[PDB]
Amino acid sequence: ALLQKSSELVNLNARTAEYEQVMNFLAKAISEHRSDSLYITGPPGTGKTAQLDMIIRQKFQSLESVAVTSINCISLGEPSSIFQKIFDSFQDLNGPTLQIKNMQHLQKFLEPYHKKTTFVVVLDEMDRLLHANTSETQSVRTILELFLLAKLPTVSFVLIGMANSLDMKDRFLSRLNLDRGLLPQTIVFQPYTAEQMYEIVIQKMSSLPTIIFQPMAIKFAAKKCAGNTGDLRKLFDVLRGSIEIYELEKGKIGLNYIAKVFSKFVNNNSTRTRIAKLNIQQKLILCTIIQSLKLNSDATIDESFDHYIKAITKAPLQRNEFLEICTILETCGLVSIKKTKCKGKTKRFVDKIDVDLDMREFYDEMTKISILKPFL
């Protein structure tokens, strides 16, 4: 069971290149003061939830008195239910009525009756809440509203932000950016040198290895993942698949998966294009759609079939053969036929045609067929 004990997908443990950087943004967690004005904002999969498990797992165990429970910004949707879920501290009788109006009714609850104690909540996936109200109206309004740090008594009620992928970071406004609270610190957490990260996950071991993964294949895996944004959860589902395709024989085999899932999504632009088409009637029609693009952008299948009897007019053929042979070009993954608005003059639905790949390699695909050269 040494192959099953190689679990790389969900595990107990930036621990890769920024260990001093994560261990120097946890300052005032024992002095009962305000620590850091940081905003964790990075690519989706770098390890923000990973560091923010350990940063509280240091301060969970025998509790100076700290009571802290983590929740998420999931069942909110609208800016309506932010404050009720964090109110399971002393399970009070109040909470529904007095609290959800105003900041001074939560400033009423910032002073601690039961000693200084501690209660710092970490609202998780906080960019998911602020993506409503369509300009700023009650979500970006709430983000410029709940980052006020105005009165600072002896009260431990800080809240670090858990922002998601860089979808709407670079969109700002002067209310969000002018000296109120926890703004001016944001860090990209991209795990470069993830080879050493995998070495830490395997050396933190409970199942002794004999033949380790080859670091040439490990560095090839770390090369062929971090070009897009550098997702680590994406790379964690690659070596697991490599040892899963190793078990299908009952670095030499941890490569054909990426050389398998890159080629599978890619397939062949022109080599398999005609190969799969093998049929000429499944070949020249793609040229008919190519000629039905530089005259009209509302390429109806009729327009793909009025182009058909403006090319072959030199055993009959009905429209059903054309629209079912187009399903082959649908099945392979080139063409899109669905109902759209059909702007035109009247606005009722009809079929469309669209193509995806750029006309560079397909123009080299016709260099072997002598009948698809005059149609270009």
Partner 1 sequence: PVIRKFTKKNVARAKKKYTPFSKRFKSIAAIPDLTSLPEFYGNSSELMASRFENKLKTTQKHQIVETIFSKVKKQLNSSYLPARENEFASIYLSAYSAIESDSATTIYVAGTPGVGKTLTVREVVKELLSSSAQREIPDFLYVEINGLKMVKPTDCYETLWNKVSGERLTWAASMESLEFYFKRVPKNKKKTIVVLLDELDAMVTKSQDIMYNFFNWTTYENAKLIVIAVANTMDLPERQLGNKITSRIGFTRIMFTGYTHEELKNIIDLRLKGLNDSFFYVDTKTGNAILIDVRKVRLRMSADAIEIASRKVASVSGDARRALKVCKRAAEIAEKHYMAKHGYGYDGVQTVHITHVMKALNETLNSHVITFMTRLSFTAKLFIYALLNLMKKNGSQEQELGDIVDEIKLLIEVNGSNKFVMEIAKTLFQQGSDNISEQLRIISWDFVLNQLLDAGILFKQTMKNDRICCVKLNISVEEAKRAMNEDETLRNL
Ligand X SMILES: Nc1ncnc2c1ncn2[C@@H]1O[C@H](COP(=O)(O)OP(=O)(O)OP(O)(O)=S)[C@@H](O)[C@H]1O
**Contact string (CB under 6 A) for ligand X, positions 159-178, x = contact:** -----xx-------------
Question: Of ligand X, Mg ion, partner 1, none, which one sits near residue 62, judging by CB under 5 to 8 A according to partner kind?
Answer: none
- Half-sphere exposure of residue 209: CA atoms within 13 angstroms, side-chain side: 11
Give the Å distances, CA to CA, from 116 to 67, 109, 337.
11, 13, 65
Phi, psi (deg, nearest 5) at residue 246: -65, -35
Asked if residue 239 lies in contact with residue 8, where contact means CB atoms within 8 angstroms, the answer is: yes
- Give exposure, 157-195, as e/b (b: 16+ Cβ within 10 Å): bbbbbbbbeeeeeeeeeeeeeeeebbbeeebebbbeebb
235 within 8 A of 225, measured Cβ to Cβ = yes
Task: Using alpha carbons only, give the angle 331, 240, 207 rounded to the nearest 5 degrees.
Answer: 165
Q: Is 313 annotated as a binding residue?
A: no
Is 48 annotated as ligand-binding?
Answer: yes
Vertex 68, ends 67 and 69: CA angle to 5°? 130
CA distance 364 to 271: 10
Residue 15 binds which one of partner 1, Mg ion, ligand X, none, with CB within 5 to 8 A depending on kind?
A: ligand X
Give me the 225-264 binding string for partner 1, x by CB under 8 A, dash otherwise.
------x-xx-xxx--x--xx-xx------------x--x
Region of 68-76, 114-122, 133-141, 186-194 interacting with partner 1 (CB under 8 A): 68-76
Among 6, 15, 267, 311, binds ligand X (CB under 6 A): 15
Task: Please identify which residue in 92, 111, 324, 364 interacts with partner 1, judged by CB under 8 A.
Answer: 324
User: CB of residue 215 vs partner 1: minimum separation in angstroms?
Assistant: 21
Query: Taking CB under 8 A as the rule, does residue 80 contact partner 1?
Result: no
Candidates 66, 122, 143, 232; binder of ligand X (CB under 6 A) is: 232
Q: How far is the CB of 47 from Mg ion (least distance, A)?
A: 9
The answer to whether 172 touches 28, Cβ cutoff 8 Å, is no
Q: State the sign of the Cα–Cα–Cα–Cα dihedral 115, 120, 121, 127.
A: positive
Could you say whether residue 233 binds ligand X (CB under 6 A)?
yes
Binding-site positions: 42-49
Interface with partner 1 (CB under 8 A):
1, 4-5, 7, 9-12, 44-45, 72, 74-75, 77, 88, 91, 128, 164-165, 167, 231, 233-234, 236-238, 241, 244-245, 247-248, 261, 264-265, 302, 305-306, 308-309, 318-321, 324-325, 327-328, 330-331, 333, 344-346, 348, 350
Binding-site positions for ATP: 42-49
